[PDB]
Amino acid sequence: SMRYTVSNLSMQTHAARFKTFFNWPSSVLVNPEQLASAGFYYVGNSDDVKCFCCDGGLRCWESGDDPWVQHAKWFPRCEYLIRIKGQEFIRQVQ
């Protein structure tokens, strides 16, 4: 067996993730560009997103929700979140 850190290899790029928000509702008010930058792609319902790396799923996004802060709130061990924001950032949010 091999260790893996990335659940969805097909969603590793920003463009691949951002494309999934083509049919995302304008009533949500969290920006799909920022969601995509934070590792998330749209998977169903009104606003379900998953992280391509940790495979964590978040929904019921509130206006003013910060995609990176939510990622660190719920999924602090995510290796993508660590690579971009660093463990200091995560420790701060936790």
Binding residues for Zn(2+): 51, 54, 71, 78
Residues that bind a copy of itself (CB under 8 A): 1-5, 7-8, 30, 43, 45, 48, 50, 55-62, 65, 67, 70, 73-75, 77
Strands 48-51 and 40-44: antiparallel
Residues 6+ apart with CB under 8 A from 8: 41, 50, 52, 53, 55
Rule CB under 5 A: choose which of 11, 35, 78, 90 binds Zn ion: 78
Rounded Cα gap, residues 20 and 62, in angstroms: 19
Residue 53 binding: pick among Zn ion, a copy of itself, none (C-beta 5-8 Å cut-off by kind)? Zn ion
